[PDB]
Design a binder for this molecule. Sequence first.
Ligand SMILES: O=C(NCc1ccccn1)c1cc([C@@H]2CCNC[C@H]2COc2ccc3[nH]ncc3c2)ccc1F
Lengths: 339, 59, 621
Amino acid sequence: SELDQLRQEAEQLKNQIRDARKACADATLSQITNNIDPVGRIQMRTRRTLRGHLAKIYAMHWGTDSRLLVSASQDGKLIIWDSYTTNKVHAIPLRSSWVMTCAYAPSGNYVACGGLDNICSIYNLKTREGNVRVSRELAGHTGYLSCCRFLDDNQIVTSSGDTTCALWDIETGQQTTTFTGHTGDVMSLSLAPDTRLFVSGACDASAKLWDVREGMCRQTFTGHESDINAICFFPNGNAFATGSDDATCRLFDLRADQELMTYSHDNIICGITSVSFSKSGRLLLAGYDDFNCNVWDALKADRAGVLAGHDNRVSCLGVTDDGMAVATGSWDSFLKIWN
Amino acid sequence: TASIAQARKLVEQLKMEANIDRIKVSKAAADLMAYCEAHAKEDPLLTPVPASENPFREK
Amino acid sequence: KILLPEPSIRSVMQKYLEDRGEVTFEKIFSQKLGYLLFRDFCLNHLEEARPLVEFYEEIKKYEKLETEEERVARSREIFDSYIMKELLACSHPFSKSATEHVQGHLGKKQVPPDLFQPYIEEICQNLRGDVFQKFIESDKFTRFCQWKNVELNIHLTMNDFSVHRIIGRGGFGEVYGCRKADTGKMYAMKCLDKKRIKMKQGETLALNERIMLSLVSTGDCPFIVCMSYAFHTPDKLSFILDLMNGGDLHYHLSQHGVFSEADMRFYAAEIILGLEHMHNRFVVYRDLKPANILLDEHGHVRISDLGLACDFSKKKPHASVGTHGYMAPEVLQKGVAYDSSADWFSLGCMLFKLLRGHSPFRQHKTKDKHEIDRMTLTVELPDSFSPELRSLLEGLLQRDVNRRLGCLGRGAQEVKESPFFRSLDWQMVFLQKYPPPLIPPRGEVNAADATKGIKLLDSDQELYRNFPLTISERWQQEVAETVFDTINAETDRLEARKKAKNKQLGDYALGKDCIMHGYMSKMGNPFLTQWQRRYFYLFPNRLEWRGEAPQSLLTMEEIQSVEETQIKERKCLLLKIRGGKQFILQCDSDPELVQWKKELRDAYREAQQLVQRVPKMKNKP
Ligand SMILES: O=C(NCc1ccccn1)c1cc([C@@H]2CCNC[C@H]2COc2ccc3[nH]ncc3c2)ccc1F
């Protein structure tokens, strides 16, 4: 039978891929970095407390200016914060209450958001008279929007609960490229520094590397035992980290095509909601369901510090492009800036 | 699924993932450490900057 | 007085009615207040439906023209103005059968009161839908929601009426003349004492009178004492009825003596139309006698006391029920099925009593019950009676049911055609245009006349728990003829000053997914009687309130249940929150509480089931 031979052949390729990876595992990152000095104690204090949202915060995103900051909340609102002064620049009432993600365009001219309405909404921030009106509603996904990220002002990439990702032409609203391959809800995506590749993490416990301009899946990474809720690139585009419900973070190298490190402790049992690297990639920050944010030594896999200043789940975090601070959003309706 | 075309699509996908050039983990690990070393000075969260260059420290 | 709610009531009211299919054109157009607002919308606020309703109104005025000389003049005016001149401009949206029917009769000079009846069907077909949806979108349907909110929130107490002198005394209570305070409409209040009902074991009659009054009080019959409201206190049962302060015929039969055949012809004619209206609604009265025939201030009469009247639409009665001397032979015979034929035989006994001073079977001044029975079971008409009257009573007092007048398969129409009524125009009888033979003088002084040491129990009150009632057609007519125009103008200038003041000072519900929004009072510290009146907004995932934008809310995932409880003798909403906390809400009306309870329940069930299937929003161990 042909269908049986195609199933048999797909198994041999999985074994061939497995043995090729084991042929590269000559040493480990833990052995390699066994010589460098520890980071020591990372003692970060709260500098700002952003008060405004009336319910759970689900997602935030820093602007490239390392000062402006947008967040999405259960109260059906997007708030664009001035982190330096805690003043709210724009409070955007959304057409749908079920917002789940938000993004800040690199130029700062647009923000995006979406959720259980299965739509990515582009909001314009340049109109003089009218204050922040919808410029586009990107419809096409058959499941909830879980994450979206601008490439520039004319293209954006989205992940969805329909197990796919998509690249959009904002001017025409067209879904120009579809990224199929996942077998579960895609939970998060992360663009590479050159915005030519992006990684996605799904509920199939696998992460995938995609070619933006060609629409193909280049590499698939396994290892997590539960859903991957968060993902972000290493600052040089050669590695990425994933946070999962299995209470672990993992680092994956692209060129070696496998996992390098597992960040976990027996005390930590709750899942990870967000991950981010410090500016130099030395620190891996992760948000947890136990109300804490843990700072990990990315090279030695030690606990460097703990951010404890929320009374509910830390649902999102992010480091500024200048590396000056980290923001943490929570289910207690507050954002906090740490450095 | 019983789809033959779907099974071909998966076999062709696994071949794209199998026929890539992989480097040793030792080289991959060294390049990552060399990046952290080169930029450990530009990382305000790593090597702490004084309160002057910090926009969030009493300004 | 009457206070209309703010136009913001539309949000809750429109969903309340739409859940009951009450936003149909057939349902709003056929209501007195709905018609007035829908008509006010078509005339002034729409150039397209203005000719359609003016055409409808000219027909309804044509139907009320009494004589033929008026209908020949009116039918031509309507045809020349709403048929011909519309057909000359090709803007006549009616079928060919409609024009051929009216023009066919006019050239033939036939003017029945239902000449333009085919147009009534088509005028509604053009108003329904297109014009009806543009009406819902307007402020007139908002005003309809405001009035309907008042109607559905009616809870009458004794303090809602100014009670005056007694106009009737009976075995179970009294009847007072009263005035409804908010509108000024004069009514009568039949007040029955629950206590005197238990001692005499008449709970069946009291409850039966309400359902019987409910079956007949629609359509405004001029010859039956109809009911507008019914309510109870812990001690009394109150019916609100047509005011009849002229006493019964039993009293007037004594003060005046016997009536002539002509004076009897008046009371006979008006009673027949009352029995016809009751028989058309499948009700047999069984208790027809001069004591149950009341007079108004001018001398016209109505049938009253429907306690012994029973429905015979399903099972015909067979029990011996009535007053001895008026019960038909098949009534006294227990186990013998009978129907409306009892009232026609009762009419014969009663009409003879007005003529000769006694029942035909209560002879030689007897008080014995068993004697009046047998003289009826198995017909001396005096030499004084005329042959036409002799024919009427002989027909009405036939012992055989198959030979009795009014029982031959056409109902009251047979009795109308009796040669005794050959001189009457029965439309003039319905319009109460014949002069009454007896005009009562002011001041009752016992004109409608017919202790205890027992206590009431909780089981006795449960029989009376379904007693409150309000006839919607009655309340709207009461309102329309009194304060409907004055209240509409008073509450229109207030909504105008509101926009005159808000435009200088500065909607949160538009442009989103808001389900419902309106006013509600949430409880703060209950020891301070701290009720905070806030405007609430219900979203699919949260409930916000404000007083100033909303600064707090309540998510649908916090809510564990929505249960209706009572706090200080008032219905309130109790929400139990996941954090062991309780949320208390109070509305301004019963339909608002019914709707918030339904929508809040619908929102937390749908939202919690939705959040469960989303990994980012659901709770994890
Ligand atoms: O208990 C009474 N019935 C027996 C009964 C009635 C109901 C339930 C059970 N058992 C009763 C009777 C009477 C009257 C007495 C003479 N027969 C005529 C009765 C009609 O009385 C009036 C008078 C003026 C009015 N204007 N609008 C309405 C109205 C009514 C009065 C009060 C009663 F309470």
